[PDB]
Amino acid sequence: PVVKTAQNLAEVNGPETLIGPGAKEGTVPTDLDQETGLARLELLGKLEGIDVFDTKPLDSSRKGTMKDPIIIESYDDYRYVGCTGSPAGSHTIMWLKPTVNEVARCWECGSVYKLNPVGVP
Amino acid sequence: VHFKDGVYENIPFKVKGRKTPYALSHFGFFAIGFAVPFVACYVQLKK
Amino acid sequence: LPPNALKPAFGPPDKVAAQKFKESLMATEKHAKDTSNMWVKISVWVALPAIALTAVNTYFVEKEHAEHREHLKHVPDSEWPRDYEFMNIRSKPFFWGDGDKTLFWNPVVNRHI
Amino acid sequence: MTHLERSRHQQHPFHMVMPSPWPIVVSFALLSLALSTALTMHGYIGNMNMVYLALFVLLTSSILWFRDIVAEATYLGDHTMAVRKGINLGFLMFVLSEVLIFAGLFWAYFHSAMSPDVTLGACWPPVGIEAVQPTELPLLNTIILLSSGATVTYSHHALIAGNRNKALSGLLITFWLIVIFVTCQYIEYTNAAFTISDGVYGSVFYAGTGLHFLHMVMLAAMLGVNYWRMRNYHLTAGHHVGYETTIIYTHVLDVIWLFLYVVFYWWGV
Amino acid sequence: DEETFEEFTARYEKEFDEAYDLFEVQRVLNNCFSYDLVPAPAVIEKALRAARRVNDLPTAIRVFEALKYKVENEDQYKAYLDELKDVRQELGVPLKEELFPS
Amino acid sequence: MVQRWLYSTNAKDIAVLYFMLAIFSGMAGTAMSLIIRLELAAPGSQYLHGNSQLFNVLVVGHAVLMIFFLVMPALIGGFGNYLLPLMIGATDTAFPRINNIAFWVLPMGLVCLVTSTLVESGAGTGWTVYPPLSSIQAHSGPSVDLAIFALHLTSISSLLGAINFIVTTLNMRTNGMTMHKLPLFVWSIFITAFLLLLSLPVLSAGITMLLLDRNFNTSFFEVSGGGDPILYEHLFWFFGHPEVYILIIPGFGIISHVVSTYSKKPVFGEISMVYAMASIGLLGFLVWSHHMYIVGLDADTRAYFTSATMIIAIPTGIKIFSWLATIHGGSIRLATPMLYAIAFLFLFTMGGLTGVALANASLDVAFHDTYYVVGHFHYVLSMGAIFSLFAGYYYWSPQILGLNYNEKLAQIQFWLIFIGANVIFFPMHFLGINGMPRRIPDYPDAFAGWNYVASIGSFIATLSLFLFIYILYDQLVNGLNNKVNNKSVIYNKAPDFVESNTIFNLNTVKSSSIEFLLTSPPAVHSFNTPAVQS
Amino acid sequence: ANKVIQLQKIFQSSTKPLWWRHPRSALYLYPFYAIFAVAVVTPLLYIPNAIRGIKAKKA
Numbered sequence A: 001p002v003v004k005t006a007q008n009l010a011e012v013n014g015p016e017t018l019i020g021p022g023a024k025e026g027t028v029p030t031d032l033d034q035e036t037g038l039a040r041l042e043l044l045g046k047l048e049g050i051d052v053f054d055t056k057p058l059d060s061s062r063k064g065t066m067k068d069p070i071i072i073e074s075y076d077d078y079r080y081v082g083c084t085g086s087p088a089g090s091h092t093i094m095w096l097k098p099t100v101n102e103v104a105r106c107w108e109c110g111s112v113y114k115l116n117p118v119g120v121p
Numbered sequence B: 001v002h003f004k005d006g007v008y009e010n011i012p013f014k015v016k017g018r019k020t021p022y023a024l025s026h027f028g029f030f031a032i033g034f035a036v037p038f039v040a041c042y043v044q045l046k047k
Numbered sequence C: 001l002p003p004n005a006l007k008p009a010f011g012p013p014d015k016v017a018a019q020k021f022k023e024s025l026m027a028t029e030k031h032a033k034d035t036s037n038m039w040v041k042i043s044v045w046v047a048l049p050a051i052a053l054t055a056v057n058t059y060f061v062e063k064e065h066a067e068h069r070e071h072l073k074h075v076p077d078s079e080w081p082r083d084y085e086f087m088n089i090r091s092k093p094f095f096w097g098d099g100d101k102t103l104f105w106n107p108v109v110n111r112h113i
Numbered sequence D: 001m002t003h004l005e006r007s008r009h010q011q012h013p014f015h016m017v018m019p020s021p022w023p024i025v026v027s028f029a030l031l032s033l034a035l036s037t038a039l040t041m042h043g044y045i046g047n048m049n050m051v052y053l054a055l056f057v058l059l060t061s062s063i064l065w066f067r068d069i070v071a072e073a074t075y076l077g078d079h080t081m082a083v084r085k086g087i088n089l090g091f092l093m094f095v096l097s098e099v100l101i102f103a104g105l106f107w108a109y110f111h112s113a114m115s116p117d118v119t120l121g122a123c124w125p126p127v128g129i130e131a132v133q134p135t136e137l138p139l140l141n142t143i144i145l146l147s148s149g150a151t152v153t154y155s156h157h158a159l160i161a162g163n164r165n166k167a168l169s170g171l172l173i174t175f176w177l178i179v180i181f182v183t184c185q186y187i188e189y190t191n192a193a194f195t196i197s198d199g200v201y202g203s204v205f206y207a208g209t210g211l212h213f214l215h216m217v218m219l220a221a222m223l224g225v226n227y228w229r230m231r232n233y234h235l236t237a238g239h240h241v242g243y244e245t246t247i248i249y250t251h252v253l254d255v256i257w258l259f260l261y262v263v264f265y266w267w268g269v
Numbered sequence E: 001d002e003e004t005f006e007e008f009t010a011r012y013e014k015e016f017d018e019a020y021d022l023f024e025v026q027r028v029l030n031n032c033f034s035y036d037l038v039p040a041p042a043v044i045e046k047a048l049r050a051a052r053r054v055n056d057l058p059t060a061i062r063v064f065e066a067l068k069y070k071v072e073n074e075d076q077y078k079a080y081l082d083e084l085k086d087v088r089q090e091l092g093v094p095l096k097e098e099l100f101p102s
Numbered sequence F: 001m002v003q004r005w006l007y008s009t010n011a012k013d014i015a016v017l018y019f020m021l022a023i024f025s026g027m028a029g030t031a032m033s034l035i036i037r038l039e040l041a042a043p044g045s046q047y048l049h050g051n052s053q054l055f056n057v058l059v060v061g062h063a064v065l066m067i068f069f070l071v072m073p074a075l076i077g078g079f080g081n082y083l084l085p086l087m088i089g090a091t092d093t094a095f096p097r098i099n100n101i102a103f104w105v106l107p108m109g110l111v112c113l114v115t116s117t118l119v120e121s122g123a124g125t126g127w128t129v130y131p132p133l134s135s136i137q138a139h140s141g142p143s144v145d146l147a148i149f150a151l152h153l154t155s156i157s158s159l160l161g162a163i164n165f166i167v168t169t170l171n172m173r174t175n176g177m178t179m180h181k182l183p184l185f186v187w188s189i190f191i192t193a194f195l196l197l198l199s200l201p202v203l204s205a206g207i208t209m210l211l212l213d214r215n216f217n218t219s220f221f222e223v224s225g226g227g228d229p230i231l232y233e234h235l236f237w238f239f240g241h242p243e244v245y246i247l248i249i250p251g252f253g254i255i256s257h258v259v260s261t262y263s264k265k266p267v268f269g270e271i272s273m274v275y276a277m278a279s280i281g282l283l284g285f286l287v288w289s290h291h292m293y294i295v296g297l298d299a300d301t302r303a304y305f306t307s308a309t310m311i312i313a314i315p316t317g318i319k320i321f322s323w324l325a326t327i328h329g330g331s332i333r334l335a336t337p338m339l340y341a342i343a344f345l346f347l348f349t350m351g352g353l354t355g356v357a358l359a360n361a362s363l364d365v366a367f368h369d370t371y372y373v374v375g376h377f378h379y380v381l382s383m384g385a386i387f388s389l390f391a392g393y394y395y396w397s398p399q400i401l402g403l404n405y406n407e408k409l410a411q412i413q414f415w416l417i418f419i420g421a422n423v424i425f426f427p428m429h430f431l432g433i434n435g436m437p438r439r440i441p442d443y444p445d446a447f448a449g450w451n452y453v454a455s456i457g458s459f460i461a462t463l464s465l466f467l468f469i470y471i472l473y474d475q476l477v478n479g480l481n482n483k484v485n486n487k488s489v490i491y492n493k494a495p496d497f498v499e500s501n502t503i504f505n506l507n508t509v510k511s512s513s514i515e516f517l518l519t520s521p522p523a524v525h526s527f528n529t530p531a532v533q534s
Numbered sequence G: 001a002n003k004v005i006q007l008q009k010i011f012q013s014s015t016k017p018l019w020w021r022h023p024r025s026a027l028y029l030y031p032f033y034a035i036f037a038v039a040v041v042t043p044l045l046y047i048p049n050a051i052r053g054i055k056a057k058k059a
C-alpha cells in the first residue's frame, strides 16, 4: 500500500503523512502543496481554525482550593506553572511544579494546581 | 537530540569512572592556564 | 494504552478565523497581482527610458574619458606632475606581485611611485 | 486531532536543530584565515596561495552551512511561523549591524572632510586629487540600483500572486542589473585617478565604496541562490524567507548607496 | 490601594475563618504577619481558633513567638498576652518561654 | 561525546564550554596581573630584566584577556546561554548554530592572541591600540595584526551572541510572559545584547582601519598622509564606553536576583529597574568622549560631555538604592552570593563615586593616565564583574551542576578576595592623585610604598583564586557528599517564621524564576510542554 | 526539475546526519574534508618559524 497526505487535522497519523503533493509543472508551489512536517501540521491547523502549539496563559480566574484544583494539562508528567494571584497579576511570580503524584500549592495565594497527564510517550 | 543526563553527564570531562585521578586533569588544566604567560615571558626574554 | 490517549482535545474547528485566513490568502493574491501589474507599468514606463537616457550620456562621457586617457598614455616620466606628500605613500611594501602596485592599479593613469 | 496523535509532535513551534559540525568548521577556517593572512602580510609565508586556500575553505564551509539550512527549511519543513519570524528578525538585526559599520565609515569621512588637515591643504578634496565626477558613471550606477529595487519588488509580488515566469524573469533581470553595477564599479576603480594610498581621500573613499561593493557582491550571491531556489521549486507562495531576506538586503544596500552617492560625490566635489 | 487597619482586620478575620487545613493556616499567618503592623487581637484570636480547627499545636505557639519578634516593645507583648489570656487558657497553648524554661 | 561538545547545538553545553574557556583565560589574565604587580613592587627592574616591551605586552595581554576572554565570555556566554533560554522557558535558543560558532570562534581568538604574544616582539600598545604607536612605523612585525584578529574574532562572537539573545528573548518567550513580566537578568542580557549590536560595528570599523593603515599603505591615521590619530580615539571610545557598560549590566542583572532571593522579598520597583538599565544603555553611547578630555576638545564639547557623563549617575543611583530597598526589611540569609552582593554594592558605589570625580573635564586634567583611573576602573570592573561572577557561580552552580560546594571554604575565599582586592586597588588612588603616570614598568622612587602594599595585596588575590579553583575540585568530586553531610547549604531560602518543616518540605523551592524548579542538572531538552504563567 | 517531494521523502526517511542525506553528499564532502585538513594544518605549521624569526625565503 501507500500513505495518504492528511487533508485535514483528523486524518494525520505520523510524520510521513504530512508530505503532500508537489507543484505541477510551471506553477509556483502553494503552501498546501509542498509544506512538510511540523510547518505543514501548523498550516493544516491554521486552515481548520485550530491553533496548534497552544499559547494560552494560565487560568487565573479562580483560586483553586484543594477540593477543586485548577486542572492543567501536560503531555509530560509535570509542568512548570507560574502563579501570580486570583486576579491576573495580584502578587509576585511564583513558579511551581505540578507532577502526576503531587499537586502544587502556591504558598503566597494558596492556589492548588492539579496536573492531568495526556502522556502516551 | 537524546543525550544522557544526570549528575556528571552535563560536563565535558570525566570525573568518576577514571583510570588516572581527577585531580591530575583538574589542576593540569588550570596549571597550563597559569603557565601560559610564563611561556610568553620565557620566549620574550630569550629574545 | 492510557485511557486519555483517544480523547480529542483540540477544541472546535469552526471559528471564523479559519475563513478569514483563507479569505486573506485570496486577498493577498489579488492585491499582489494588482501591485505586480502596477510595477510592470513603472518598470517599463520609467526604468527603461531612464536607463537608456543615462546610458547614452554615459557612453559619450566614457568615450571622452577613454580618449583623454589615451592621450595621457603618451606622457613621458618627467612630464608627470609633482606627487604630493600625502599621495601614494609607501609605509611598507605590498606582499602581492612585486611591491609598489595596488589591486586595481592602472599604470596608464596611476604612474606615481 | 486526538491525544495519542498530538503526543508525537514538537508541542512548541521553534526548531530543535540537529547537531552539525559547521560552527567549529567555519571557526577553524576563520582561524586559519586570520593566521595565514597575518603571516603572509609580513613575509613569513612566501606567496598568497595559503590565504587563497583559507578563503576557499571558509567559503565552502559557509556554503555547506547554507545547504543544511535550506535542507531544513525545504525538505524537513522545520521552519514554521515562529521560526520564520525569528530568522526574519535575526536578518534584520544583522542588517542593522552592517548599517552601523557604514555609519562608522561615514564618521571617518565626515571627520576627515569637516576637519581638513593642513598637510592636505585645508580644502576637500586635497590639492592634486581630481575627484570622481558624480554625473558620469555613478549616475548610471545609482539609477540601475533604483531599478534593481523596482525589479525585486515586482518579482516578489509576482511570486506572491502565483505567476512563475514573471517572477523568474524579474529575479533574473535584477541579478544581471546588480552585476552590471559590480562591473561598472570595477571599471570605475580601474580607470580612476587616485589610489587607496593617495591620502585620506583615497583612503576613506575606497574604504566606503569598496565595502559597499563587497556587500553588492554578497547580494549577487544571494540573488543567484534565490534564482536557483525559485527555479527548482523551493519557494512557495506564502513560505519564502530567503526572498524576503534578499529583497530587504537589496533595499538597504540601495539606501546605503544613495547616501554614499550623495555624500561622497555631490558633497565631496 | 492601601488598606486601613480595620479593613486589614476584617480581611484577615475572613481569611482565618475560611482556612481549611494546615498549609492554609500557616500561609494566612505568614502573610498576616509580613506587614508593617502588629495585627489586632481579634486577628490573633481567629488565628488560634484556626490553628485549633486544623488540630495543630505548635503554630499556635508560633503565633505568640512571632508576636514577640514582631511587636516593638517588651510591654506591648505583655498587653497582648494578657488580652489573650482567656483564649490561651481555653485552648491551652503555652508560650515558648514558659515551655522551654531557661 | 564528539557530537555533544564539538557539534553542539543546545544552549547549556555551549554555556559550560563558554564558562570553561572563560575561567581558563581568567586564570591566564590573573597570572599576567600577578607578573605585572610583581614587577611593580619595588623600583628598578626586579624580575623582567629591563624589557619594558614585555611589560607592555603583558599589560595588553592581561587587559584584553580579563575583558574579552573572562568577563564577557563568562557573563554573556555562559550565564546567558544557561539561563536566558531557561528563565523565559524557551526550549533551545533560536539560531543555535550561531550560538555554537560564537563560542568556537572565541578560543582561536585566544590562540592568535597567544601567538601575537609569542611572535617577533609582541603587541605593546596598551589595550587601547592607539596609532601611530600601533602603526607599522612603531610596531613592525605581525604581532599587532594578530591582536587585532583576536579582537575581530571575539567581536564576531559578541555580535552573533547578541543577535541570538535578542531574537531569543523577543520571539521565544513562554506563553504567559509579556515583556513586562520578564526577570531582571533576562532584561539585563537583552539590553546588553542591544549595546553589543550597536557598539561592535564601530570597533570593527576602527580596528580594520588600523589594520588597513598597518598593511595596505593607506592613511586613516598616519599624519604623513593627512590622517588623524584622534579619529581612532573617537571610534574606539564610541565602542569603549558602551563596552564597559556591557560588562557591568549583567552584574546589575545577577545582583538583583541574588539580593531578592537572599532577602526573601522582591525587588523594589522592578519596572523602574528595567527603565534604569535601559536608560544606562541609552546613555552610554552619548558619553564616549570623556576618555579623551586631554586631546584638545572645545570647551563647549567638554562642558557637554561632563554633563552627559554625570547624568548616568542618576539611573545607577536608582539601581543602587533600589537594591538597598530590597535588602531593607527582608530576612537576610548571608550565604556567599549574598556576601558577594553586599560587597558588590559597597565597592561598586566607591568605584562609581571615583568615576563621578573623573567625569569632570576640569579634574580629568589632573587625573588622566594616572593610577587614579585604574583605581576607578579596577574597582568597578573587578568588584562589579568578578563579584558578580562569583555571586552567579555560587548562586546557580548547585542547580546547573547538581553538586554543592563547601561553604566554609566559600566564605574564606570571599573574605580573602575582598580584603586582597581592597588592598590592591585602594592605594592606586593615592598613587594617581600624587601623579604616578600609567602603563610604566618603573617609577620615581617616591611611589614605592604604595606599590609595595598593592603588590602585597596581589598575592592575597591570587591565593583566593587558587582557593576558588580548589573549591571547584571539591565541588566536582564531593558534591553529593556535600549534600548529604552539613558542609554546604542545601536550601537557599529557609522556612518563614511560621512555617513548619514538613509544610516546607512539600514546597521546598520558592522562587520567582523558573531555573530553581528545574531538576539538578536539568534535562537535556526540558520544557516539553511550555511553561505556563498567569 | 521539482525534486522537492522526492527529496522530502529521502531526507525524512533517513538515519544519517543531515549533511549526508542527499545522494550527492560524498561528492562534496570528501574533498572538502581533505582540503580543510590541509588548510588548517599548514598555517599552524608556520608558527615556529614565525616565533623563531625565519621569514620566508624569496626564491
Ligand code: HEA
Binding pocket: F022, F023, F026, F027, F030, F033, F034, F036, F037, F059, F060, F062, F063, F064, F066, F067, F070, F071, F074, F125, F126, F127, F128, F374, F378, F381, F382, F385, F386, F389, F390, F393, F421, F424, F438, F439, F440, F458, F461, F462, F464, F465
Ligand atoms: C576585567 C577587568 C579587569 C580585572 C578583573 C582586572 C584585575 C586585576 N588587574 Fe587589571 N587591567 C584591566 C582590566 C582588569 N584587571 C584593563 C582594561 C587594564 C588596562 C591596560 C592599559 O591601560 O593599557 C588593566 C591594567 C592593570 C594594571 C595597570 C598597570 C599599568 O597600566 O601600569 C594593573 C596594576 O596592578 C593590573 C593588575 C590587576 C590585578 C592584580 C588584578 C586582580 O584583581 C586579580 C585578582 C582577580 C581575580 C582573582 C579574578 C578571579 C578570577 C577568575 C578567573 C574569576 C572566576 C569566577 C568565575 C569563573 C565565575 N591590571
Ligand code: HEA
Binding pocket: F128, F244, F245, F247, F248, F290, F291, F292, F309, F310, F312, F313, F314, F316, F317, F318, F320, F348, F349, F351, F352, F353, F355, F356, F358, F359, F360, F364, F367, F368, F369, F373, F376, F377, F380, F381, F384
Ligand atoms: C565596569 C565598567 C565601568 C563602569 C560601570 C564605569 C562607570 C563610570 N565611569 Fe569609568 N572607566 C572604565 C570602566 C567603567 N567605568 C574603564 C575600563 C576605564 C579606563 C579606560 C582606559 O583608560 O583604557 C574607565 C575610565 C573612566 C574615565 C576616563 C578617564 C580618563 O581616561 O582620563 C571616566 C571619565 O568620565 C570615567 C567615569 C565613569 C562614571 C561617571 C561612571 C558611572 O557610570 C558610575 C555610576 C555609579 C555611581 C555614580 C555610584 C552609584 C550611585 C550612587 C551611590 C548615587 C549617588 C551618586 C551621586 C549623587 C553622584 N571612568
Ligand SMILES: CCCCCCCCCCCCCCCC(=O)OC[C@H](COP(=O)(O)OCCN)OC(=O)CCCCCCCCCCCCCCC
Binding pocket: B011, B012, B013, B014, B017, B018, B019, B020, B024, B025, B026, B028, B029, B030, F015, F016, F019, F020, F078, F079, F082, F397, F400, F401, F472
Ligand atoms: C590533561 C591530562 C589528561 C590525561 C588523560 C589520560 C587518559 C587515560 C585515561 C584516563 C581516563 C580518561 C581521561 C579523559 C577524560 C578527561 O580527562 O577529559 C579531557 C579534557 C581535555 O582533554 P584533551 O583533549 O586535552 O586530552 C587529550 C587526550 N584525549 O580535560 C579537561 O577538559 C580538563 C577540564 C578541567 C575542569 C574544569 C573545571 C571547571 C568546570 C566548570 C563547569 C561548571 C560551569 C557552571 C557555569 C555554567
Ligand SMILES: CCCCCCCCCCCCCCCC(=O)OC[C@H](COP(=O)(O)OCCN)OC(=O)CCCCCCCCCCCCCCC
Binding pocket: E002, F321, F324, F325, F328
Ligand atoms: C534624599 C533622601 C533619599 C536618599 C535615597 C534614599 C536612601 C537609600 C536607602 C533607602 C532604604 C529604605 C528604602 C525602603 C523603604 C521603603 O520602601 O518604604 C516604603 C514606605 C511605604 O509607606 P506607606 O505604606 O505610607 O505608603 C504606601 C504607598 N506608597 O515609604 C516610606 O517609608 C516613606 C519614607 C519617606 C522618606 C523621607 C526621607 C526624609 C529625609 C530626606 C533627607 C533629609 C536629610 C536631612 C539631613 C539633616
Ligand SMILES: [Ca+2]
Binding pocket: F039, F040, F041, F042, F043, F044, F045, F046, F441, F442, F443
Ligand atoms: Ca619596578
Ligand SMILES: [Cu+2]
Binding pocket: F240, F241, F244, F290, F291
Ligand atoms: Cu567610560
Ligand SMILES: [Mg+2]
Binding pocket: F368, F369
Ligand atoms: Mg591617555
Ligand SMILES: [Zn+2]
Binding pocket: A083, A084, A085, A094, A106, A108, A109, A110, A111
Ligand atoms: Zn499564587
